[PDB]
Design a binder for these strands. Structure first.
Ligand code: QUI
Ligand code: QUI
Lengths: 8, 10
DNA sequence: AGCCCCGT
DNA sequence: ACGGGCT
């Protein structure tokens, strides 16, 4: 859920 | 980090 | 080389 | 079920 490096 | 020393994160 | 970490 | 960006 977070997007800091992937954003799922 | 930074830039420099992007982000984190972005 | 890195206050490098995060939830819906 | 998920790996990313510039000084
Ligand atoms: C998003 O909120 C979120 C939280 N935990 C995860 C674990 C593994 C893959 C993706 C995830 N996304
Ligand atoms: C993004 O690809 C990414 C990878 N590893 C992490 C570890 C801890 C927090 C956030 C992260 N983000």
């Amino acid at each position: 859920x977070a997007x800091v490096x992937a954003x799922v | 980090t930074x830039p420099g020393v992007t982000x984190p994160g972005v």
